[PDB]
Amino acid sequence: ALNLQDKQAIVAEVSEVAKGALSAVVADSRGVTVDKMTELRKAGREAGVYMRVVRNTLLRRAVEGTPFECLKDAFVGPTLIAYVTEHPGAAARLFKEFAKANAKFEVKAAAFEGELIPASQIDRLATLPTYEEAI
Amino acid sequence: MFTINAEVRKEQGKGASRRLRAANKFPAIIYGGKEAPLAIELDHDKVMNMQAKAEFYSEVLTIVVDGKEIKVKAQDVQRHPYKPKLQHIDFVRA
Amino acid sequence: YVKLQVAAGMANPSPPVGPALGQQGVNIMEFCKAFNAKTDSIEKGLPIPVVITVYADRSFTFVTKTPPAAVLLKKAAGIKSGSGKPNKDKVGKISRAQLQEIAQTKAADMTGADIEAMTRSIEGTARSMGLVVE
Amino acid sequence: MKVRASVKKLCRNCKIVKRDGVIRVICSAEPKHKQRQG
Amino acid sequence: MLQPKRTKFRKMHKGRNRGLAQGTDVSFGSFGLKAVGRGRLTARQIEAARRAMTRAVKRQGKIWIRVFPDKPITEKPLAVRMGKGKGNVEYWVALIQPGKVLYEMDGVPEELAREAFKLAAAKLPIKTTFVTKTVM
RNA sequence: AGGAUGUUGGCUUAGAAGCAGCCAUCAUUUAAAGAAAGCGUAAUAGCUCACUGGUCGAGUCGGCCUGCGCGGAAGAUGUA
3-state secondary structure A84-135: ECCCCCCHHHHHHHHHHHHCCCCCCCEEECCEEECCHHHHHHHHCCCCCCCC
Domain boundaries, given as residue ranges, for chain B: 1-94
Q: Which of C25, C6, C8 is nearest to C16 (CA)?
A: C6
Number of domains in chain E: 1
> Hey, what amino acid is at C108?
A
A133 within domain boundaries: no
Which range marks the domain in which residue A122 is found? 4-127
Query: Helices (H) and strands (E) in chain E — how many of each?
Result: 2, 7
User: How far apart (Å, rounded) are the C-alpha atoms in residues C59 and C53?
Assistant: 8
Resolution (A): 2.7
DSSP 8-state secondary structure symbol assigned to residue E61: S
Q: HSE-up of A25 (CA within 13 Å, CB side)?
A: 28
* Whole-angstrom distance, CA of residue C63 vs CA of residue C67: 12
User: Edge-to-edge strands of the sheet including C60-64?
Assistant: C2-7, C47-54, C60-64
Contacts of A58 (CB under 8 A, 6+ apart): A7, A10, A11, A14
For B17, residues 6+ apart whose C-beta sits below 8 A from its C-beta are B26, B27, B88
E115 within some domain? yes
Whole-angstrom distance, CA of residue C106 vs CA of residue C93: 19
The runs of H, that is alpha helices, within E77-129 are 110-121
For residue D33, give Cα distances in angstroms to C41, C76, C95, D17, E123. 59, 53, 56, 13, 25
Cβ contact (<8 Å) for E99 and B77?
no
Domain contains E76: yes
Could you tell me which CATH number the domain at B1-94 has?
2.40.240.10
Task: Read off φ and ψ for residue C30, nearest 5 degrees.
Answer: -55, -60
The 3-state DSSP class for residue E38 equals: coil
Subunits close to D (at least 3 CB pairs below 8 A) = none
**Count of CB atoms situated within 10 Å of the CB of E82:** 5
- How far apart are the C-alpha atoms of E136 and B42, rounded to whole Å? 19
Does A66 lie at the interface with C, CB-CB under 8 angstroms?
no
CATH of residue E133's domain is: 3.90.1170.10
Domains C2-64 and C69-129 share a fold: no
Among all protein residues, pick the one whose CA is nearest to the C1' atom of F28.
Answer: C112
Q: Does A86 fall in a domain?
A: yes
Domain C2-64 has CATH 3.40.50.720: no
CA nearest neighbour of C88 among C122, C124, C129: C129
Residues A59, A14: contact at Cβ < 8 Å?
yes
CATH number assigned to the domain comprising residue A14: 3.30.70.1730
β-strand partners of C4: C50
Instruction: Report DSSP letters for B32-70, one per residue.
Output: -SSSPPEEEEEEHHHHHHHTTSGGGGTS-EEEEETTEEE
Instruction: Please name every residue paired with C6 in a beta bridge, in sequence order, or none if there are none.
Output: C48
Domain assignment of residue E130, yes or no = yes
Phi, psi at B61, each rounded to 5°: -100, 155
Does the beta carbon of E27 lie under 8 angstroms from any beta carbon of chain B? no
CB contact under 8 A, A38 and C111: yes
SS3 C119: helix
The answer for E 49-108 residues in CB contact with B (under 8 A) is 98-99
> What length does chain C have?
134
Q: Within 13 Å and on the Cβ side, how many CA atoms surround B13?
A: 4
Inter-chain contact C113–A45, Cβ cutoff 8 Å?
yes
Q: Do chains B and E touch (3 or more CB pairs under 8 A)?
A: yes
d(CA E17, CA E51): 27
What is the side-by-side strand order in the sheet with E101-106? E62-65, E101-106, E31-35, E128-132
Q: Which residues pair with E89 in a beta bridge?
A: E74
Judge: E135–B81 Cβ closer than 8 Å, yes or no: no
State whether CATH 3.30.70.120 applies to domain C69-129.
no
Q: Is E23 on the interface with B (CB under 8 A)?
A: no
Q: Distance (Å, rounded) from C-alpha D3 to C-alpha C19?
A: 51
- Domain of E67 in residue numbering reads as 21-136
C113 CB near a chain A CB, below 8 Å?
yes
Residue A11 within any structural domain of the chain? yes
- Distance of C105 CA from F34 C1′ (whole Å): 27
Q: How far apart are CA B92 and CA C7, in angstroms?
A: 82
Residues 46-75 of A with CB under 7 A from strand F: 51-57
E38 in a domain, yes or no?
yes
Contact, E102 vs E47, CB < 8 A? no
Q: How far is the CA of C12 from the C1' of F26 (A)?
A: 36
CA Rg value for chain D = 9
Whether residue A95 lies inside any domain: the answer is yes
Q: How far apart are CA A6 and CA A25, in angstroms?
A: 25
Instruction: State the helix-helix crossing angle for A91-102 and A34-46, rounded to 10 degrees.
Output: 160
Chain B residue whose CA is closest to E127: B82
Across the interface, whether the CB atoms of C113 and A38 are under 8 A apart is answered no
List, as own/partner pairs, every contact residues D9-15 make where C-beta atoms lie below 8 angstroms and the sequence separation is at least 24, other chains included.
none
Instruction: Give how many domains chain A has, as a whole number.
Output: 1
- Bridge partners of E92, per DSSP, are E72
